Design an enzyme around this catalytic site. Structure first.
Site, PDB file in Angstrom:
ATOM      1  N   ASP A  48       0.834  -1.193   0.000  1.00  0.00           N
ATOM      2  CA  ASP A  48       0.000   0.000   0.000  1.00  0.00           C
ATOM      3  C   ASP A  48       0.877   1.254   0.000  1.00  0.00           C
ATOM      4  O   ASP A  48       2.084   1.209   0.245  1.00  0.00           O
ATOM      5  CB  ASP A  48      -0.943   0.015   1.210  1.00  0.00           C
ATOM      6  CG  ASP A  48      -2.150   0.922   0.996  1.00  0.00           C
ATOM      7  OD1 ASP A  48      -2.326   1.470  -0.125  1.00  0.00           O
ATOM      8  OD2 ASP A  48      -2.938   1.078   1.944  1.00  0.00           O
ATOM      9  N   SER A  49       0.248   2.392  -0.249  1.00  0.00           N
ATOM     10  CA  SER A  49       0.993   3.622  -0.432  1.00  0.00           C
ATOM     11  C   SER A  49       1.292   4.368   0.871  1.00  0.00           C
ATOM     12  O   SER A  49       2.076   5.316   0.841  1.00  0.00           O
ATOM     13  CB  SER A  49       0.235   4.528  -1.402  1.00  0.00           C
ATOM     14  OG  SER A  49      -1.153   4.563  -1.097  1.00  0.00           O
ATOM     15  N   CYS A  74      -6.339 -28.902  10.514  1.00  0.00           N
ATOM     16  CA  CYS A  74      -7.548 -29.716  10.536  1.00  0.00           C
ATOM     17  C   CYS A  74      -7.255 -31.180  10.241  1.00  0.00           C
ATOM     18  O   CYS A  74      -8.094 -32.044  10.535  1.00  0.00           O
ATOM     19  CB  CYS A  74      -8.574 -29.161   9.542  1.00  0.00           C
ATOM     20  SG  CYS A  74      -9.239 -27.537  10.012  1.00  0.00           S
ATOM     21  N   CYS A  98      -6.699 -28.081   5.477  1.00  0.00           N
ATOM     22  CA  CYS A  98      -5.443 -27.569   6.013  1.00  0.00           C
ATOM     23  C   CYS A  98      -4.797 -28.566   6.979  1.00  0.00           C
ATOM     24  O   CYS A  98      -5.417 -29.534   7.444  1.00  0.00           O
ATOM     25  CB  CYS A  98      -5.646 -26.208   6.687  1.00  0.00           C
ATOM     26  SG  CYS A  98      -6.009 -26.179   8.467  1.00  0.00           S
ATOM     27  N   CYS A 116     -12.279 -28.644   5.832  1.00  0.00           N
ATOM     28  CA  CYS A 116     -11.024 -27.952   5.565  1.00  0.00           C
ATOM     29  C   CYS A 116      -9.884 -28.929   5.318  1.00  0.00           C
ATOM     30  O   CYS A 116      -9.695 -29.889   6.068  1.00  0.00           O
ATOM     31  CB  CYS A 116     -10.665 -27.037   6.730  1.00  0.00           C
ATOM     32  SG  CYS A 116      -9.141 -26.116   6.448  1.00  0.00           S
ATOM     33  N   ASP A 123      -7.656  -7.935   0.166  1.00  0.00           N
ATOM     34  CA  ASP A 123      -6.823  -8.043   1.354  1.00  0.00           C
ATOM     35  C   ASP A 123      -7.746  -7.814   2.539  1.00  0.00           C
ATOM     36  O   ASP A 123      -8.747  -7.106   2.409  1.00  0.00           O
ATOM     37  CB  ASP A 123      -5.688  -6.993   1.361  1.00  0.00           C
ATOM     38  CG  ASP A 123      -6.180  -5.589   1.773  1.00  0.00           C
ATOM     39  OD1 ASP A 123      -6.271  -5.300   2.989  1.00  0.00           O
ATOM     40  OD2 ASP A 123      -6.481  -4.766   0.884  1.00  0.00           O
ATOM     41  N   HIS A 177      -4.953 -22.019  10.021  1.00  0.00           N
ATOM     42  CA  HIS A 177      -6.254 -22.465   9.531  1.00  0.00           C
ATOM     43  C   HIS A 177      -7.006 -21.336   8.831  1.00  0.00           C
ATOM     44  O   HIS A 177      -7.570 -21.534   7.748  1.00  0.00           O
ATOM     45  CB  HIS A 177      -7.110 -23.014  10.669  1.00  0.00           C
ATOM     46  CG  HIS A 177      -8.550 -23.146  10.291  1.00  0.00           C
ATOM     47  ND1 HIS A 177      -9.024 -24.204   9.548  1.00  0.00           N
ATOM     48  CD2 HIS A 177      -9.599 -22.313  10.475  1.00  0.00           C
ATOM     49  CE1 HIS A 177     -10.317 -24.041   9.333  1.00  0.00           C
ATOM     50  NE2 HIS A 177     -10.689 -22.897   9.878  1.00  0.00           N
TER      51      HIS A 177
HETATM   52  N1  LIG Z   1      -4.393   3.154   0.024  1.00  0.00           N
HETATM   53  C1  LIG Z   1      -5.550   2.776   0.578  1.00  0.00           C
HETATM   54  N2  LIG Z   1      -5.578   1.752   1.433  1.00  0.00           N
HETATM   55  C2  LIG Z   1      -6.823   1.400   1.967  1.00  0.00           C
HETATM   56  C3  LIG Z   1      -6.800   0.336   2.883  1.00  0.00           C
HETATM   57  C4  LIG Z   1      -5.565  -0.464   3.244  1.00  0.00           C
HETATM   58  C5  LIG Z   1      -5.292  -1.655   2.212  1.00  0.00           C
HETATM   59  C6  LIG Z   1      -3.950  -2.322   2.413  1.00  0.00           C
HETATM   60  C7  LIG Z   1      -3.316  -2.979   1.366  1.00  0.00           C
HETATM   61  C8  LIG Z   1      -2.087  -3.592   1.553  1.00  0.00           C
HETATM   62  C9  LIG Z   1      -1.476  -3.560   2.788  1.00  0.00           C
HETATM   63  C10 LIG Z   1      -2.093  -2.911   3.837  1.00  0.00           C
HETATM   64  C11 LIG Z   1      -3.321  -2.295   3.652  1.00  0.00           C
HETATM   65  C12 LIG Z   1      -8.034   0.004   3.464  1.00  0.00           C
HETATM   66  N3  LIG Z   1      -8.298  -0.930   4.456  1.00  0.00           N
HETATM   67  C13 LIG Z   1      -9.596  -0.809   4.662  1.00  0.00           C
HETATM   68  N4  LIG Z   1     -10.193   0.125   3.884  1.00  0.00           N
HETATM   69  C14 LIG Z   1      -9.207   0.676   3.108  1.00  0.00           C
HETATM   70  C15 LIG Z   1      -9.218   1.716   2.188  1.00  0.00           C
HETATM   71  C16 LIG Z   1      -8.001   2.084   1.624  1.00  0.00           C
HETATM   72  C17 LIG Z   1      -7.929   3.202   0.680  1.00  0.00           C
HETATM   73  O1  LIG Z   1      -8.904   3.845   0.304  1.00  0.00           O
HETATM   74  N5  LIG Z   1      -6.669   3.473   0.216  1.00  0.00           N
HETATM   75 ZN   LIG Z   2      -8.226 -26.030   8.650  1.00  0.00          ZN
END
Ligand SMILES: Nc1nc2c(CCc3ccccc3)c3nc[nH]c3cc2c(=O)[nH]1
Ligand SMILES: [Zn+2]
Ligand SMILES: Nc1nc2c(CCc3ccccc3)c3nc[nH]c3cc2c(=O)[nH]1
Ligand SMILES: [Zn+2]
Lengths: 352, 352
Positions: free
Chosen positions: B79-80, B292, B289, B287, B249, B318
């Site tokens: 993520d950024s 399990c 895994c 499951c 994610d 799990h």
């Molecule tokens: N950049 C960004 N991340 C979000 C995340 C974390 C995803 C993430 C990806 C990879 C690693 C960590 C976090 C959000 N989590 C819940 N809602 C979210 C919204 C946004 C969003 O609008 N922008």
């Molecule tokens: Zn399992």
């Protein structure tokens, strides 16, 4: 089929021995380290004290016994519970019948271990506090010897247990040679499958423990396994094997693993220390474990500093693997007649 | 050799799609769940916010990048960082240049992700708080779109990154259809390798999120992957795949695993509850895994009640395995033209 219990010694060097314990559920190579089953080892430990409280020994038997419960079909040793009551319980009340806490007796201890289904059953003893006067140590030892006979009888009264498990007697006597001799004589007269040196690893320091082992281990039957309870650090184990010990347990691999301490051939390290933040070497350069095959000190340092459970698991996997590599090296070097050289080489590198 | 980035759709059912993302480091089957790499998955997540603080992005590059650092040679998404700063940091200061906390900008975000070495790089966006008025949502979205162009340019200025990684744009606009359309238009005009639906999983509830997905996902380029960020519970994922999402994610598998909650085809369970103390069935009957395969709910309940780290590891293994079995079932049923039946069958059993 393997026998209920057979100990054979394949090779010796000085007082050190290496060999095997055959039991119905598997072979145990000695010298052996026995890790807590709650996490290769040949035998694991069950936690009698915890299990009799949660979920209870009866509930474990209802669930099919500890082997089924833990998913482990090989031998299991269980302690007799009094040491644990005496150290981790409150409002303890002692008497000739047993101990009361918030009634564990020899008979109940043995029945609990029977319901748990363990393969190696410990006599119900009193780990004498340290330090102790001659008189208190004798009193305590004399009661443990009466309790050892009561454990023998309780064990022999349960057919499934008498025919499939093994019973170990526990020598007491604090640091006193004459009390250790009396304890050893009383146990040998009762007769057990193995003999534990109890009442050490109670704060005495390695010098005193080695001194007590010097005269205590040769009082036990030579032809039966010798179990030093609660020991110990890697240098403790090496020195105790030099003194005739065949079996070990210790809280260190798992306690250290949860608190950032890794054992290596160059001594322990605390992986949380900043000096490891950019160290790309594995936890130990020689270690064959999976953690050391894939990951650096730097990444494990990062996981633990970050509070990730993965880190404590990787440290624990390494520490347990390291202890088993230690035992394997002790067995190989005894069997090859170079254990004395190994001990000297181990200590020079471990303490450097 | 695989291309830098190629998304192909193998089969569709309604709005749902299944296919593959090819990247130099491996293939990603979609729909994909992407677990935190800090612990089979085709891609894992790096934690940009944590890593820029400990040990720092430069230190990670010095250690050879995140693939080397974590021992993972397959794709990594990062993520950024702004979402994480905006939720878990203090004394935040925002401006057109970026965010200051105790200065993360589009350019610095991209450079951090470059030094980390991640394969899928997220544009630097502002996850608009929920709820938000039209005016604040528009203001926020307009800044994220300016920041998306700045992220595009920073990414394209780094040759190793432009030629080996992929860049995703993040749609914003809160719950407003016209702002989501504008955001989608601005991103498509910039051009990205994939498109994320941002600004959900921020407390809106599943009904509102599904409503926003209904009109929002079809605004994105159909021929590129769609990543719903932060989502979600198993029923969230199923419904989002029904709405055209390809990538997910969520904090749930690992957060739940550390707090005693296991996901099953019959819904989540809290394994610490007494009703499991004597339950000999595995965590989930179907499951596949390893947990399990070997252990009961009763033993995992016991480990967790006892505070043993082993329990939290087995629950986490799990939960992550369960999520990947879920995704595999979604992909198979889409590919076989019975995803609609699957979703109905999943919800009837999961909520029963
Ligand atoms: N950049 C960004 N991340 C979000 C995340 C974390 C995803 C993430 C990806 C990879 C690693 C960590 C976090 C959000 N989590 C819940 N809602 C979210 C919204 C946004 C969003 O609008 N922008
Ligand atoms: Zn399992
Ligand atoms: N019964 C007994 N146990 C001891 C333990 C626990 C060993 C144990 C074995 C298996 C499982 C748990 C604990 C000791 N730990 C350190 N010093 C110890 C001394 C004694 C002792 O004298 N008697
Ligand atoms: Zn190792």
């Amino acid at each position: 089929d393997r026998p209920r219990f057979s100990f054979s010694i394949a090779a010796r060097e000085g007082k050190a021995r290496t060999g095997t314990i055959e039991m119905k559920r598997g072979v145990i190579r000695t010298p052996a380290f026995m890790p807590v089953g709650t996490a290769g080892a040949d035998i694991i430990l069950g936690n009698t004290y915890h299990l009799m409280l949660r979920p209870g020994a009866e509930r474990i038997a209802k669930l099919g016994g500890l082997h089924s419960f833990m998913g482990w079909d090989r031998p299991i040793l269980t302690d007799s519970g009094g040491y644990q009551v005496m150290s981790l319980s409150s409002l303890t009340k002692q008497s000739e019948e047993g101990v009361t806490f918030k009634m564990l007796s020899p008979e109940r201890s043995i029945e609990i271990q029977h319901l748990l289904g363990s393969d190696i059953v410990m006599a119900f003893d009193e780990c004498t506090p340290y330090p102790a006067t001659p008189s208190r140590a004798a009193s305590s030892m004399e009661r443990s010897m009466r309790w050892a006979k009561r454990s023998r009888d309780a064990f022999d009264s349960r057919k499934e247990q008498a025919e499939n498990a093994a019973l170990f007697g526990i020598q007491q006597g604090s640091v006193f040679e004459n009390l250790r001799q009396q304890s050893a004589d009383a146990l040998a007269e009762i007769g057990f499958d193995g003999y534990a040196v109890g009442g050490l690893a109670v704060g005495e320091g390695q010098d005193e423990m080695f001194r007590v082992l010097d005269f205590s281990v040769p009082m036990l039957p030579d032809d039966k396994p010798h179990y030093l309870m609660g020991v110990g650090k890697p240098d403790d184990i090496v020195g105790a094997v030099e003194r005739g010990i065949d079996m070990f347990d210790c809280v260190l691999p798992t306690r250290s693993g949860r608190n950032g301490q890794a054992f290596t051939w160059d001594g322990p390290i605390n992986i949380r220390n900043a000096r490891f933040s950019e160290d790309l070497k594995p936890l130990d350069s020689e270690c064959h474990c999976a953690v050391c095959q894939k990951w650096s000190r730097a990444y494990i340092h990062h996981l633990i500093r970050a509070g990730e459970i993965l880190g404590a698991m990787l440290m624990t996997e390494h520490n347990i693997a390291f202890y088993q590599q230690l035992m394997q090296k002790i067995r190989d070097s005894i069997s090859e007649g170079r254990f004395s050289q190994f001990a000297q080489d181990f200590r020079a590198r471990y303490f450097a």
